[PDB]
RNA sequence: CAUUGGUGAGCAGCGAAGGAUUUGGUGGAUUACUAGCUAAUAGCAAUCUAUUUCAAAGAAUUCAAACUUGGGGGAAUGCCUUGUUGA
């Protein structure tokens, strides 16, 4: 279930799942906490901008949300988590299997009610502690005491009392002492909602049959009764702006406002939220404000505002009806299709069964917007035919988008269910286009495609004809008729030369788009279901009905790779941007990544819900998928973008049960030396050879033109007097006798000791190794410090060291450079004593090896003579 | 300078004149900018000049 | 923003100058806008002259005198980089100080620079007129307060009233 | 083919912000305007990150482990980029103008100086996968009354010294339990506190102010408290301290002054180690190596970057770039070098790999308009608005000749004969094409016939004809060579802005003011193709524009075009935010590249934010110079009507995104585009794409290795090419024994011959197997020499790469080998005595 | 005869509880989403201000300071510099 290439990132397009949202105040500002499946999101009330998201997904779905100042409490299963800025600060685990249902926090007490009518009280260990952690006591409400707990509320100015509201009646529990202070009279109708009023001792109770009660706890008596026959109260809220208003939300999707002072109805907002998804699940007046925030199960959050009265006198009577202020939303049902709008990962296009198309922004949620379905006026001038009652376009089965001509004309084509024409949209305007493309053969639209240039749109009909329209003018230009069954895929190469089609009849047609000719036809064993064309590589994969993905090269019209392993139908698949991977999803609840070069499955996942779509970002950073459940889009991060991934084939049997290293990582490190006989340069920069030979002249250029000014009184040993790293040759310490010019024993340099050791051992491999590691300045200093006085042992030894190096044929271009520096620094000494046998013998041996390395000159001279001739004449 | 910038450098070039320059023999590496590289190693004076 | 405000001597008019260059003159009681300039420039401070009819604005480098309706009357080329403005109502002198460390007195009636004095203490950080005797108090970065008159090239008094800029 | 990606940015080494040394000290990170460039001084390699801010970078920093880099623009927008993978981890907006950012020496925490608040965050773990909110806040400190100038971490990652504009330096403790240890404020500075540091023992605190005073603080009895025991002063007559840095180990204090000169001091003795001047412009940033031996300085005005080795008094690096000045570019024939001409009058030679300016030329008085290389490559020619065309000899860096018209005309375009014996230049005020003889310097003739200014010129590399285009809506082909001179005019629908000549010399392409690229047949003088480009061009609305970008006709045409050396592609650019790469035979757009994403540049955006618009006008158009504290920033030297050819201070308007010239690399699948920010180079080097050629089911990476083990070298090599995997080609290439090379080379199919030659050239230039590669090249040329001759233009780029390898590295080795042979013989044969 | 001139009188065709044009206001975007205030290692968010004061530290002969002027000629009286007189 864990992928080695992909990891979940977040969900897109979901604002609320229907659980009542929580409102908390930080200073003068307000924020709203909404539940999204197993995670909650925090919005700023002023702008509805996303601020925080829960760091980790809870093991179980969240049931309750309560927020007080910085801290947010989220209840799931039998555990209550405490979050600050979306990061968990402490997890409260109850000691009973009964799941938490309701949650209340007043002062240092946290009250959690389980579904078995048991109330757990947690207290702060210290009065100054930010949140309660310590377990205080347990209070249980028995059936004789009352019915099932409806909600836990705390009224202001009540010392250590919790007002437990049950279906039968209301109860007053003293949390400190754990005793039942007061029991209210039984109510004929089932209670569904409770809300503390801004007045003292009064809590508003909402019944199941459209009755709202202003129950007074101090007197224990009814005060008022509002009646809403044939309705169910889902939320209640009071206006604290100085106006005695009461907003009653209903499961029908209506929000009613009452004026308590005048005993009248101000206004009713009809169908603000869908009845099918629970209507008004939560509707709360912002404290001290005329703004009311409403939510529902339809994945939407809205805000309404009361404007000031237009009458200079009697403003209380002339109440402006509430006005829509701002809202956030998404699909009400799972998206059916998705697509990346642009090369970068800014925007995604989404379509859902709710007949609405959305443009979702990954970089910021506020940028997400719904594309309008308002139709343009017809060019001919005739009246457009349609029902006066406005309805959204049918569900979108397919979509094709290009950005070559964005802002110039239509750049999206969409196919709709049971519809004989395709509609166009404009991404720049975010509105439906002015063209409609018809199949012209009495068949439904099954495939839509666009050319890279953005000028042509291709429509595939269920009767087998491919019609080609022009996006700018919407004029039918060409019609191809090869397939006799439905065309399930159309694609055109980037060059606009070769066009490929596939259909349920199983044939793959290759057309020359410009010449309009049938280049070839290829028959496959099973009907083809879908196509994805990779324009850069000229490869396209086909999802066959035999549970295989067949990769075909359009240039040669042959099958190159065939992929097996899926146990059921392949819902969707996509190419990686580099053209090296295919990620496919199937009905068997798995997502597999396939490596085309080796033609094997390298990664496997098991999704709880079948993934209906899969899409790579053109960058390759992100992978977006949609599932049969959930209104949002799951975004995955591509781990391969930050490290190499092994291409070893996944184990099939272990995967089913759950339901050469250089080649594995697609790399190769060049050998140190292909053969001993072959000359090989050093493993390093090629400027080292040039830096060594011309060191002095390069440094003269480096010196500043004007001498720097310095203080006359300067420490003589400043460079050495350093607090403590410098690894230069100057900063060398001796390692542990008659005076010797080269170096006295116990006072000898590391290099000279290695040189003397090599001379006795008759091998300078250790010396040659350290020479290569020396810096260019260090190399010059050592050679120039070589002993130049009789019997000339060190010079002879150095020549023997270099002569050995040339035999190895490795790093020879440094050894030539070292010998060049030796003559430069000790040429006169060698010249004056050329007749000395030791120098003469050592020099002669060097020439014997050096003479052999003249074949390289012949190779260089040949290639210049030919390469100059071949390129010229 | 001010007039040339004001006219967007659409001025009329100055009359041509001849002047003498002295070139001193130096290694070609010195004339280059300071970096860990050199492009040419020749001398600044040709054999005819010497 | 930010906005520097200067009321008229009789309190009937309000002159406001935003930093980004939004200058407005208005009668705040009756809410009548006498003038409004949208100079695309950095304005530091503004002041009313003898009455609401004329006002001065210290812009990026020069001080400008304006009319009641917002018509520019003069560009004070002599006052450079003025950051503070003050008007001596009984003497009809306009006073400026800024990054130049130069205190300049300008006669609005005759339009002649009465005197320009060198403070020699760098940029001027603060300024306030003594309404009783019309002596200008300037604070400097060295933390001293100097009292000035147009007729003396040297300060009348020097007071050390801070350890840092005033 | 058409898979190009931004690789590095030449022409600029430093724009603004703080330059930072890598922890190992072998890499220098320099912000170049909107991006970050990394220079590897030891290996002589450079690269610029692909991620792009929306405004200029203000602060950057690389953690000690060398894994994470954080870069912050002028608005507080921050990007966390994985240094090793060169990929962006997260984008963070701090919602305020962050002045400095610094990783703790432990690496766990990094601190932000955002206005008057010091923000300490926890570093995201590089190994962990990306999450929604990788950063975790640690603490925010609010003690300063004004903006924080800088901050310094203690060597133990426990204390932070913050210096602000409050004339105060303040110390904090990272751990709350240790707040009592460091809760002090350091006062007594007359001006802004530029920097505060700890000593190596951490018992001494040094603070430096803008006025030029260094205070030495110690914990001493008057019962124990921090006191200023000693005070030192930089007696700069008028220069103000601009940037300060301190190395506790070596006790080195490097101070950069506004006069453009920096001093190195030894604390606490206050001994002046050195004093040097980089110029007259302020020293904006100074940084110290970890060892303390290299000091990096940067000046924003001229874009200078100086790495100084104060120990040896030597310049490791001394570079100066161009901003909004590069008028043209030219590749060397081997492609190793790229030359640029600037409005300053200076011609600079840049090395593609290292990214530094090898040489500079300053003969030209006015802006240099064009630069072009001879076919041979040793000689270079340039033209300038001063009215002279100058020939440059690269081997001795001498202007060996200079050409000038008799009427003193400004020259805007240039063309050089393939033989290098004739030079032609054109003008925008003469209507004639002047011709000079290279050997003599005499004006051979003036070509007449154009009724408008000549916009461009080009010689045919083979036919040696001259093609000229003008605003006269016509193109003329001059047969100047030969006993008879002929001219063939071809009419065009609109003004011709650019012209490119086919390498074959058989066709010429012209970009017109209509946004059209029309290809003509030179011999037949008839049109053979046309490419529409007005729709492809992306042009942005300027802040000052009162008309939409869609209706704007400012630049919907390409002012420069160039063929690919194969002859099948055209790369085009203009005064617009797009570089478009077209395919000639099929007349389609292969790809489009966005030149810049910097909102500082004027032409980047097609749509501007309506919030900026007000009743006065655009909020951007308001000049905020007066708010600046320093006088030099407040001074306005702008001339009223200047558009071009002066310093940026003169224009008074934002720089405009535009491409002055474009060219293809002679030796690689890359192209370079000169623009305002610098010389953008796009290359296909990475080759992560899977672009197979002629696969079958039998071909697989496993199967190729099986062929190698069975010793079927030819089949293994061919199957590797059909996969087209670089690693698999390299594996097979090195596994073929030397005896079998001649057999394999003679038997490679002709289709794969261009591919092997391309691989060898790219591989050989940086590989260590000089002899093995030379054996392969010898086998290939001998086996298929005739085939390469028949198709020169298919193999042109591959052949140039091989020649570069044989000339630039192979010849250098034998040159060092051969001189030892002669130096050897002289020492032994000769008689040395007395 | 032609109007690619204006103004009207009507068809064919398009055509689901109407259609077309213009316009005021507000909301969301137009840069990439880590929450409000303060005296900020924490408080507040109903504020305290009835501990908010003490202690410590903190003052360059830089005791310098128009880098800021449209050109030509002067400048009585001013202002700057230099000397000088008498205290």
Curated annotation (Swiss-Prot), chain A:
Q: Where in the cell is it found?
A: Nucleus, Nucleolus
Leader sequence segment = none
Q: Which UniProt keywords apply?
A: Acetylation, Nucleus, Phosphoprotein, Repeat, Ribonucleoprotein, Ribosome biogenesis, rRNA processing, WD repeat
Pfam families, per the entry: Beta-prop_WDR36-Utp21_1st (PF25171), Beta-prop_WDR36-Utp21_2nd (PF25168), Utp21 (PF04192)
InterPro entries noted in UniProt: Quinoprotein_ADH-like_sf, SSU_processome_Utp21, WD40/YVTN_repeat-like_dom_sf, WD40_repeat_CS, WD40_repeat_dom_sf, WD40_rpt
Is the keyword Nucleus assigned to this protein?
A: yes
Additional comment: Present with 2020 molecules/cell in log phase SD medium.
Task: State the domain notes.
Answer: The WD repeats are grouped into two tandem seven-bladed beta-propeller regions.
Give the protein name, as stated in the record.
U3 small nucleolar RNA-associated protein 21
Curated annotation (Swiss-Prot), chain B:
Signal peptide coordinates: none
Top-level taxon? Eukaryota
The disulfide bridges present are: none
Entry's localization field: Nucleus, Nucleolus
Q: Would you identify the family this protein belongs to, as annotated?
A: Belongs to the MPP10 family.
State the oligomer form and interacting partners: Component of a heterotrimeric complex containing IMP3, IMP4 and MPP10. Interacts with snoRNA U3. Component of the ribosomal small subunit (SSU) processome composed of at least 40 protein subunits and snoRNA U3. Interacts with the SSU processome subunits EMG1, IMP3, IMP4, KRR1, NOC4/UTP19, NOP1, RPS4A, RPS4B, RPS6A, RPS6B, RPS7A, RPS7B, RPS9A, RPS9B, RPS14A, RPS14B, UTP1-UTP18, UTP20-UTP22 and UTP25.
Q: What does this protein do?
A: Involved in nucleolar processing of pre-18S ribosomal RNA. Required for the early cleavages at sites A0, A1 and A2 during 18S ribosomal pre-RNA processing.
Q: What is this protein called?
A: U3 small nucleolar RNA-associated protein MPP10
Q: Report the source organism.
A: Saccharomyces cerevisiae (strain ATCC 204508 / S288c)
From Swiss-Prot, chain C:
Ranges occupied by WD repeats? 1-38, 119-158
Q: Which residues form a coiled coil?
A: none
- What does the UniProt entry say about where the protein is found? Nucleus, Nucleolus
Where does the chain cross the membrane?
A: none
Task: Kindly state the subunit structure of this protein.
Answer: Interacts with snoRNA U3. Interacts with MPP10. Component of the ribosomal small subunit (SSU) processome composed of at least 40 protein subunits and snoRNA U3.
Spell out the note in the miscellaneous section: Present with 5800 molecules/cell in log phase SD medium.
Job description of the protein? Involved in nucleolar processing of pre-18S ribosomal RNA.
Name by which UniProt lists this protein? U3 small nucleolar RNA-associated protein 7
Q: Which organism is it from?
A: Saccharomyces cerevisiae (strain ATCC 204508 / S288c) (Baker's yeast)
User: Upper taxonomic classification of the species?
Assistant: Eukaryota, Fungi, Dikarya, Ascomycota, Saccharomycotina
UniProtKB/Swiss-Prot annotation, chain D:
GO BP terms in the entry? endonucleolytic cleavage in 5'-ETS of tricistronic rRNA transcript (SSU-rRNA, 5.8S rRNA, LSU-rRNA); endonucleolytic cleavage in ITS1 to separate SSU-rRNA from 5.8S rRNA and LSU-rRNA from tricistronic rRNA transcript (SSU-rRNA, 5.8S rRNA, LSU-rRNA); endonucleolytic cleavage to generate mature 5'-end of SSU-rRNA from (SSU-rRNA, 5.8S rRNA, LSU-rRNA); establishment of cell polarity; maturation of SSU-rRNA; maturation of SSU-rRNA from tricistronic rRNA transcript (SSU-rRNA, 5.8S rRNA, LSU-rRNA); ribosomal small subunit assembly; septum digestion after cytokinesis
Q: Which organism is it from?
A: Saccharomyces cerevisiae (strain ATCC 204508 / S288c) (Baker's yeast)
Q: Which family does it belong to?
A: Belongs to the WD repeat PWP2 family.
Q: Which Gene3D superfamilies match?
A: YVTN repeat-like/Quinoprotein amine dehydrogenase
Q: Provide the assembly information.
A: Interacts with snoRNA U3. Interacts with MPP10. Component of the ribosomal small subunit (SSU) processome composed of at least 40 protein subunits and snoRNA U3.
Question: Where is it mainly found?
Answer: nucleus
Query: Keyword Ion transport: yes or no?
Result: no
* Cellular component terms per the entry's GO annotation: 90S preribosome; cytoplasm; nucleolus; nucleoplasm; Pwp2p-containing subcomplex of 90S preribosome; small-subunit processome
GO MF annotation terms: mRNA binding
Residue stretches of each WD repeat? 11-51, 52-92, 93-131, 143-182, 188-222, 236-275, 278-318, 321-360, 363-402, 406-448, 449-488, 491-530, 553-592, 654-692
Extract the PROSITE patterns matched here.
Answer: WD_REPEATS_1 (PS00678), WD_REPEATS_2 (PS50082), WD_REPEATS_REGION (PS50294)
- Using the UniProt annotation, give all residue ranges assigned to the region (Disordered): 631-652
- Per the record, the gene is PWP2
Instruction: List every position bearing Phosphoserine.
Output: 629, 642
Claim: rRNA processing is one of the keywords in the record: yes
């Amino acid at each position: 279930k864990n992928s080695k290439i992909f990891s979940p990132f977040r969900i897109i397009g979901n604002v609320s799942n229907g659980v009542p949202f929580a409102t908390g105040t930080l200073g003068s500002t307000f924020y709203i906490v909404t539940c999204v499946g197993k995670t909650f999101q925090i919005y700023d009330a002023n702008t509805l901008h996303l601020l925080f998201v829960s760091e980790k997904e809870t093991p179980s779905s969240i049931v309750a949300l309560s927020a007080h100042f910085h801290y947010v409490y989220a209840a799931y299963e039998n555990k209550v988590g405490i979050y600050k800025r979306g990061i968990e600060e402490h997890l409260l685990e109850l000691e009973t299997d009964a799941n938490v249902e309701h949650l209340c926090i007043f002062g240092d007490y946290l009250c959690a009610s389980t579904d078995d009518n048991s109330i757990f009280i947690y207290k702060k260990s210290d009065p100054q502690d930010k949140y309660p952690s310590e377990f205080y006591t347990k209070l249980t409400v028995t059936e004789i005491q009352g019915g099932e707990i409806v909600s836990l509320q705390h009224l202001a100015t009540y010392l250590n009392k919790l007002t437990v509201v049950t279906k039968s009646n209301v109860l007053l529990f003293n949390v400190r002492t754990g005793k039942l202070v007061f029991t209210s009279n039984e109510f004929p109708d089932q209670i569904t909602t409770a809300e503390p009023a801004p007045v003292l001792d009064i809590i508003a109770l909402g019944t199941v049959t459209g009755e709202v009660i202003m129950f007074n706890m101090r007197k224990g008596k009814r005060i008022r009764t509002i009646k809403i026959p044939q309705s169910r109260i889902s939320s209640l809220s009071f206006r604290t702006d100085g106006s005695s208003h009461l907003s009653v939300g209903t499961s029908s999707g209506d929000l009613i406002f009452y004026d308590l002072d005048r005993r009248s109805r101000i206004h009713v907002l009809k169908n603000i939220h869908r009845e099918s998804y629970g209507g008004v699940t939560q509707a709360t007046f912002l404290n001290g404000q005329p703004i009311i925030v409403t939510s529902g199960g339809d994945n939407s959050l809205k805000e309404y505002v009361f404007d000031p009265s237009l009458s200079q006198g009697s403003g209380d009577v002339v109440v402006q009806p509430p006005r829509y202020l701002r809202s956030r939303g998404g699909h009400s049902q799972p998206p059916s299709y998705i697509a990346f709008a642009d090369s970068q990962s800014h925007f995604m296009l989404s379509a859902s069964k709710d007949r609405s198309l959305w443009s979702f922004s990954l970089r910021k949620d506020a940028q997400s917007q719904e594309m309008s379905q308002r139709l343009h006026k017809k060019q001919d001038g005739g009246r457009v035919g349609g029902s006066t009652i406005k309805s959204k376009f049918p569900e979108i089965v397919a979509l094709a988008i290009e950005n070559a001509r964005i802002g110039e004309w239509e750049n999206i084509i969409t196919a709709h269910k049971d519809e004989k024409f395709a509609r166009t949209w404009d991404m720049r305007n975010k509105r439906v286009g002015r063209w409609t493309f018809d199949t012209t053969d009495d068949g439904f639209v099954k495939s839509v495609a666009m050319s890279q240039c953005g000028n042509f749109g291709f429509i595939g009909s269920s009767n087998g004809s491919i019609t080609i329209y022009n996006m700018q003018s919407g004029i039918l230009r060409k019609k191809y008729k090869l397939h006799k069954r439905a065309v399930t895929g159309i694609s055109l190469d980037g060059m606009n030369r070769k066009m490929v089609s596939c259909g349920l009849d199983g044939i793959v047609g290759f057309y020359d788009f410009n010449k309009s000719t049938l280049l070839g036809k290829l028959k496959l064993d099973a009907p083809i279901t879908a196509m994805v064309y990779h324009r850069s590589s000229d490869l396209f994969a086909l999802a066959l009905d035999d549970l295989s993905i067949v990769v075909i090269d359009a240039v040669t019209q042959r099958v190159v790779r065939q992929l097996w392993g899926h146990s059921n139908r392949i819902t969707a698949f996509d190419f990686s941007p580099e053209g090296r991977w295919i990620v496919s999803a199937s009905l068997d609840s798995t997502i597999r990544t396939w490596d085309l070069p080796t033609g094997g499955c390298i990664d496997g996942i098991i999704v709880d819900n079948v993934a209906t779509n899969v899409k790579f970002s053109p960058n390759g950073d992100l992978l977006a998928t949609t599932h049969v459940t959930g209104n949002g889009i799951c975004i995955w991060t591509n781990r391969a973008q930050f490290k190499t991934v092994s291409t070893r084939t996944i184990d099939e049997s272990e995967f089913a049960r759950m339901a050469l290293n250089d080649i594995d990582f697609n790399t190769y490190t060049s050998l140190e030396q292909i053969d001993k006989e072959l000359l090989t340069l050093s493993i390093g920069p090629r400027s080292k050879m040039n830096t060594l030979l011309h060191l002095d002249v390069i440094r003269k250029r480096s010196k500043p033109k004007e001498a720097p000014k310095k203080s006359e009184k300067l420490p003589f040993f400043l460079q050495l007097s350093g607090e403590k790293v410098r690894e230069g040759i100057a900063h060398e310490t001796p390692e542990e006798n008659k005076f010797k010019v080269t170096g006295r024993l116990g006072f000898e340099s590391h290099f000279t000791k290695q040189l003397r050791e090599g001379s006795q051992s008759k091998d300078y491999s250790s010396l040659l190794a350290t020479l290569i590691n020396f810096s260019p300045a260090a190399v010059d200093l050592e050679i120039r410090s070589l002993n130049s006085f009789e019997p000339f042992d060190e010079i002879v030894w150095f020549i023997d060291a270099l002569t050995q190096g040339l035999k190895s044929n490795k790093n020879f271009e440094l050894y030539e450079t070292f010998m060049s520096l030796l003559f430069k620094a000790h040429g006169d000494v060698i010249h004056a004593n050329n007749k000395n046998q030791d120098i003469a013998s050592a020099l002669q041996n060097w020439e014997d090896v050096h003479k052999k390395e003249d074949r390289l000159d012949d190779l260089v001279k040949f290639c210049m003579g030919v390469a100059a001739f071949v390129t010229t004449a | 300078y001010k007039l040339d910038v004001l006219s967007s450098v659409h001025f009329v070039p100055k009359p041509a004149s001849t002047s003498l320059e002295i070139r001193v023999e130096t290694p070609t590496i010195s004339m280059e900018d300071a970096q860990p590289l050199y492009m040419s190693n020749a001398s600044s004076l040709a054999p005819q000049e010497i | 923003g930010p906005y520097h405000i200067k009321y008229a001597k009789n309190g009937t008019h309000l002159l406001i100058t935003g930093r980004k260059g939004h200058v407005a003159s208005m009668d705040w009681r009756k809410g009548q806008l006498r003038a409004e300039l949208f100079l695309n420039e950095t304005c530091h401070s503004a002041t009313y002259l003898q009455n609401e009819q004329y006002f001065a604005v210290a812009q990026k480098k020069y001080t400008f005198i304006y009319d009641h309706e917002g018509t520019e009357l003069h560009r004070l080329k002599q006052h450079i980089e003025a950051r503070h403005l003050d008007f001596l109502p009984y003497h009809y002198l306009l006073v400026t100080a800024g990054e130049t460390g130069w205190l300049k007195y300008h006669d609005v009636s005759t339009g002649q620079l009465v005197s320009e004095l060198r403070t020699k203490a760098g940029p001027t950080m603060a300024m306030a007129q003594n309404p009783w005797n019309a002596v200008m108090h300037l604070g400097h970065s060295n933390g001293t307060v100097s009292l000035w008159s147009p007729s003396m090239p040297e300060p009348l008094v020097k007071l050390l009233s801070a350890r840092g800029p005033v | 083919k058409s898979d190009f990606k931004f690789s590095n940015l030449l022409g600029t080494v430093y724009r603004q912000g703080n330059i930072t040394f890598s922890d190992d000290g072998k890499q220098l990170l320099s912000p170049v305007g909107n991006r970050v460039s990394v220079f590897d001084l030891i290996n002589n390699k450079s690269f610029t990150f692909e991620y792009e801010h929306r405004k200029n970078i203000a602060a950057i920093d690389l953690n000690k482990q060398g894994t994470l880099l954080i870069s912050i623009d002028e608005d507080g927008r921050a990007i966390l980029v994985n240094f090793k993978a060169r990929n962006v981890l997260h984008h963070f907006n701090f919602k305020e103008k962050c002045s400095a950012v610094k990783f703790s020496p432990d690496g766990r925490l990094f601190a932000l100086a955002s206005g008057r608040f010091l923000q300490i965050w926890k570093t995201p773990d590089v190994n962990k996968d990306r999450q929604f909110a990788p950063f975790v806040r640690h603490r925010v400190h609010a003690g300063h009354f004004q903006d924080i100038t800088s901050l310094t971490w203690s060597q133990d990652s426990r204390f932070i010294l913050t210096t602000s504009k409050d004339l105060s330096a303040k110390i904090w403790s990272v751990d709350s339990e240790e707040k009592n240890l460091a809760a002090t404020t350091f006062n007594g500075h007359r001006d802004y506190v530029m920097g505060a540091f700890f000593s190596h023992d951490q018992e001494k605190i040094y603070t430096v102010s803008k006025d030029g005073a260094v205070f030495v603080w110690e914990f001493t009895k008057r019962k124990y408290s921090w006191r200023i025991t000693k005070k030192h002063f930089f007696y700069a007559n008028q220069a103000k301290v601009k940037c300060v840095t301190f190395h506790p180990a070596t006790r080195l204090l490097a101070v950069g002054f506004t006069s453009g000169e920096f001093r190195l001091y030894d604390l606490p003795d206050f001994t002046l180690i050195q004093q040097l001047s980089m110029g007259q412009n302020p020293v904006n940033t100074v940084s110290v190596n970890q060892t303390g031996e290299w000091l990096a300085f940067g000046s924003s005005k001229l874009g200078q970057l100086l790495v100084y080795e104060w120990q040896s008094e030597s310049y490791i690096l001394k570079q100066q770039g161009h901003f909004d000045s590069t008028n043209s570019l030219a590749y060397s024939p081997d492609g190793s070098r790229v030359v640029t001409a600037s409005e300053d009058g200076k011609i600079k030679v840049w090395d593609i790999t290292s990214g530094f300016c090898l040489a500079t030329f300053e003969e030209h008085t006015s802006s240099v308009t064009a630069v072009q290389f001879a076919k041979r490559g040793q000689v270079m020619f340039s033209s300038s608005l001063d009215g002279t065309v100058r020939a440059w000899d690269l081997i001795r860096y001498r202007n060996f000749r200079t050409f000038t018209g008799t009427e003193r005309i400004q020259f805007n375009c240039l063309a050089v004969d393939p033989s290098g014996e004739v030079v032609c230049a054109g003008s925008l005020d003469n209507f004639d094409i002047h011709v000079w003889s290279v050997q003599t310097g005499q004006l051979l003739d003036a070509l007449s016939g154009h009724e408008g200014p000549v916009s461009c010129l080009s010689f045919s590399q083979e036919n040696s004809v001259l093609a000229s285009a003008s605003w006269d809506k016509t193109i003329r082909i001059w047969s100047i060579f030969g006993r008879s001179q002929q001219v063939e005019p071809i009419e065009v629908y609109s003004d011709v802005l650019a012209l490119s000549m086919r390498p074959d010399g058989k066709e010429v392409a012209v970009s017109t003011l209509k946004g059209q690229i029309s290809i003509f047949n030179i011999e037949d003088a008839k049109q053979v193709g046309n490419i529409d480009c007005r729709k492809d061009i992306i042009s942005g609305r300027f802040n000052q524009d009162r008309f939409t970008a869609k209706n704007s006709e400012r630049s919907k045409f390409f002012t420069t075009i160039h063929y690919s050396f194969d002859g099948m592609a055209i790369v085009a650019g203009g005064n617009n935010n797009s570089i478009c790469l077209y395919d000639v035979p099929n007349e389609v757009l292969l790809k489009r590249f966005i030149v810049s994403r910097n909102m500082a540049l004027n032409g980047t955006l097609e749509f501007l934010n309506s919030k900026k618009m007000t009743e006065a006008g655009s909020l951007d158009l308001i000049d905020d110079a007066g708010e600046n504290s320093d006088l030099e920033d407040r001074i306005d030297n702008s001339l009223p009507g200047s558009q071009r050819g002066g310093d940026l201070s003169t224009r008074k308007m934002r720089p405009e995104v535009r491409v002055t010239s474009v060219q293809f690399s002679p030796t690689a699948n890359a192209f370079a585009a000169a623009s305002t920010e610098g010389l953008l180079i796009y290359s296909t080097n990475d080759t992560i794409l899977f672009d197979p050629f002629d696969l079958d089911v039998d071909v697989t990476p496993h199967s190729t290795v099986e062929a190698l083990r069975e010793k079927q070298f030819l089949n293994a090599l061919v199957m590797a090419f059909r996969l087209n995997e670089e690693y698999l080609i390299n594996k097979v290439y090195e596994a073929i024994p030397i005896k079998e090379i001649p057999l394999v080379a003679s038997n490679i199919p002709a289709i794969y011959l261009p591919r092997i030659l391309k691989f060898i050239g790219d591989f050989a230039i940086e590989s260590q197997h000089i002899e093995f590669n030379l054996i392969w090249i010898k086998a290939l040329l001998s086996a298929s020499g005739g085939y390469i001759n028949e198709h020169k233009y298919l193999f042109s780029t591959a052949m140039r790469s091989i020649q570069r390898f044989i000339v630039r590295v192979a010849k250098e080795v034998v040159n060092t080998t051969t001189d030892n042979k002669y130096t050897y013989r002289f020492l032994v044969s000769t008689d040395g005595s007395m």
